[PDB]
Amino acid sequence: KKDGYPVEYDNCAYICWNYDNAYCDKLCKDKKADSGYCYWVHILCYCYGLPDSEPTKTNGKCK
């Protein structure tokens, strides 16, 4: 398991709906994580307990 910002190709994270924590929680759980929230500093969804196989953000900008 891992915690992090889930991404789509390539290295592009999921922006929150507004600043909605519930949105990110649902998104994260649909990706099989334990939970998630909207990190307001970046306005991105952050997940707790993603599967090891789910891609997460690394050092790098969105393609």
From Swiss-Prot:
Cystine bridges: C12-C62, C16-C38, C24-C45, C28-C47
Q: Which segments constitute the LCN-type CS-alpha/beta domain?
A: 2-63
Specify the domain of life of the species encoding this protein: Eukaryota
Q: What does this protein do?
A: Alpha toxins bind voltage-independently at site-3 of sodium channels (Nav) and inhibit the inactivation of the activated channels, thereby blocking neuronal transmission. This synthetic toxin inhibits inactivation of rat Nav1.4/SCN4A (when tested at 201 nM). In addition, it has been shown to cause a persistent sodium channel activation in nitrergic inhibitory fibers innervating the rabbit corpus cavernosum, resulting in NO release and cavernosal smooth muscle relaxation. This toxin is active against mammals.
What is the designated name of this protein? Alpha-mammal toxin Ts3
Source organism of this protein record: Tityus serrulatus (Brazilian scorpion)
Within the intact protein, the region shown is: 20 to 82 of 86
